[PDB]
């Protein structure tokens, strides 16, 4: 049984700006484990039948796990441009996989404030699909070369989410786990 337990039941998910990719293979994957596990505010699968997940074979299954506010879950999809989609985590045009998102307000939001989870607010170039960007050099927004200083005209790129349990339903923290399926000329070791 593939470690859908570890991915979906993580104690603390990764921030979106540095999302943890878990490539799972050489294991039997059951997707009935998804449905029972979490309330799944949004469960959208692109290019795949949600049913045929159980009966289909894939050589590499990618799990991209991160926390985003509910308004930015709709950004996680092919053909979507925004803050998360352009800067932090982007999907290819023909992305084939399941995007899974459930609210985590009682878990990931602290009463004073949760500044652990961050996202990339400023970036020079929109990410190429599935890329990861953890460079934190100060954005050279100002005409002056920023010279690695944070201030006016020069913004520190990661702005904390600052989740709180009482935020609006849109801004409550949703833990998003995104699945991607390769099927290259390899021993296809994920099936049913």
């Amino acid at each position, epitope marked *: 049984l593939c470690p859908f337990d570890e991915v979906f039941n993580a104690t603390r998910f990764a921030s979106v700006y540095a999302w943890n990719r878990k490539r799972i293979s050489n294991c039997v994957a059951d997707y009935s484990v998804l449905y029972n596990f979490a309330p799944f505010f949004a469960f959208k699968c692109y290019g795949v039948s949600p049913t045929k997940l159980n009966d289909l074979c894939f050589t590499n299954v990618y799990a991209d796990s991160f926390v985003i506010r509910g308004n930015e879950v709709s950004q996680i999809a092919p053909g979507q441009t925004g803050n998360i989609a352009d*800067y932090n985590y982007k999907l290819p045009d023909d992305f084939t996989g399941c995007v899974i998102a459930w609210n985590s307000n009682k878990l990931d939001s602290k009463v004073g404030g949760n500044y652990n989870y961050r996202y990339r*607010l400023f970036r020079k170039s929109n990410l190429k699909p599935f890329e990861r960007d953890i460079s934190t050099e100060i954005y050279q927004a100002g005409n002056k070369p920023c010279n690695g200083v944070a201030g006016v005209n020069c913004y520190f790129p990661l702005q904390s989410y600052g989740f*709180r349990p009482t935020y609006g*339903v849109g801004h409550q923290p949703y833990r998003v786990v995104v699945l991607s399926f390769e099927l290259l000329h390899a021993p296809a070791t994920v099936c049913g």
Partner: antibody
Amino acid sequence: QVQLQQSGAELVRPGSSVKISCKASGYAFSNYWMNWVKQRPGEGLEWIGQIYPGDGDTDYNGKFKGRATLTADKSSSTAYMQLSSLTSEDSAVYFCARGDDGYYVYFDYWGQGTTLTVS
Amino acid sequence: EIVLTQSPALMAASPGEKVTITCSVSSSIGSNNLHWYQQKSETSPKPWIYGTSNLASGVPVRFSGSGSGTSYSLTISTMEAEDAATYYCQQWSGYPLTFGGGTKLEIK
């Protein structure tokens, strides 16, 4: 019916003391976030802070942070803003805006706005 | 700080005519986190478009926002005299909330 009521305008000499009250009627005051918007004369509005009446949680804008203290009373359903070291720039119409709790978050309801004079 | 620029500082319009108000954002923001408020002169602004397409309560059917990514647009198919106002696009993606400079819509 839902509407936010606000205290009248006042004139204050450049100083550290001023208190502006927002009155909330028609809804549970503690449930919905309360945030203040400052509109300088002939300028686009800017966001001062955010106070959750339920527990008193406060978020501030960077420039006003530490200068304006936001607090509310659950009993009387009053949301206050207190500013310090008033300057001629502080003279602006101050709105109290109730951030919506829906899927989209926005300032669904606003106060009539209080005019601060620093002189 | 996310910085919002609105294309017309003022606008001249006529009834029955399309006019568009373009709110250009420095860094792309989720459409769900951009909203438009209508501030008629010397009154409390009321929400007008929230989420770039979802009109608020009491909003006329003529109004309809558009756009996504960096460039956000508000468009009125026909400009009634009631439509004359100043419209402030807001962003909530980046936490220090930055209203637009405003587009003072006036009739020709």
